[PDB]
């Protein structure tokens with residue numbers, strides 16, 4: 797629980813973790829609908845909805861407009877996902 | 882806002898990031914064999930291989946001995962997965 801935190805900090809400092817806002821194209825759909833990791837190689841860590849923090853989001857729930865997705869992956873993969881929306 | 886993830890976990894008393902070392906029971910299996918998120922609601926952010934981090938792990942690779950799964954989810958879900966191993 798203390799080594800677990802330090803590995804996260806080390807991991808956040810060698811791979812980039814990014815905030816990304818949900819577009820209209822993507823609202824109404826779930827992250828299993830978009831099939832993100834199979835399509836981009838990206839992992840979605842959490843969702844900020846309004847002032848609520850959804851950790852380990854259920855992949856079957858509907859994404860709303862303005863949802864801020866917290867992502868981890870290579871910049872080459874994050875950039876493609878950001879452009880495809 | 883990679884700390885926003887870490888900040889939530891510190892104040893949250895029911896959610897937590899936990900490391901779990903792969904056992905022979907679990908080695909030889911993939912995380913899609915175990916179907917971890919679909920079965921427990923747990924998200925695996927990365928795998929520690931040696932002292933290196935495999936981010937957004939490919940769910941089809943076999944887990945090797947000594948692999949450290951870095952997991953994030955509800956304490957009851959994490960605890961249930963751990964007890965089944």
Ligand SMILES: Nc1ncnc2c1ncn2[C@@H]1O[C@@H]2COP(=O)(O)O[C@H]3[C@@H](O)[C@H](n4cnc5c(N)ncnc54)O[C@@H]3COP(=O)(O)O[C@H]2[C@H]1O
Pocket residue numbers: 827828829831832833834835838839840841855912913916917918919920923924925926937938939940
């Ligand atoms: N890092 C991980 N941690 C825990 N379990 C993992 C995992 N990678 C794979 N799995 C497990 O393997 C199943 C299929 O993974 P896949 O990545 O190919 O295909 C996934 C993926 O493309 C997408 N997805 C789901 N949750 C995601 C997320 N947090 N980030 C990105 N994509 C996700 O929806 C598909 C099916 O998701 P589902 O949860 O139903 O089922 C997942 C999940 O049970």
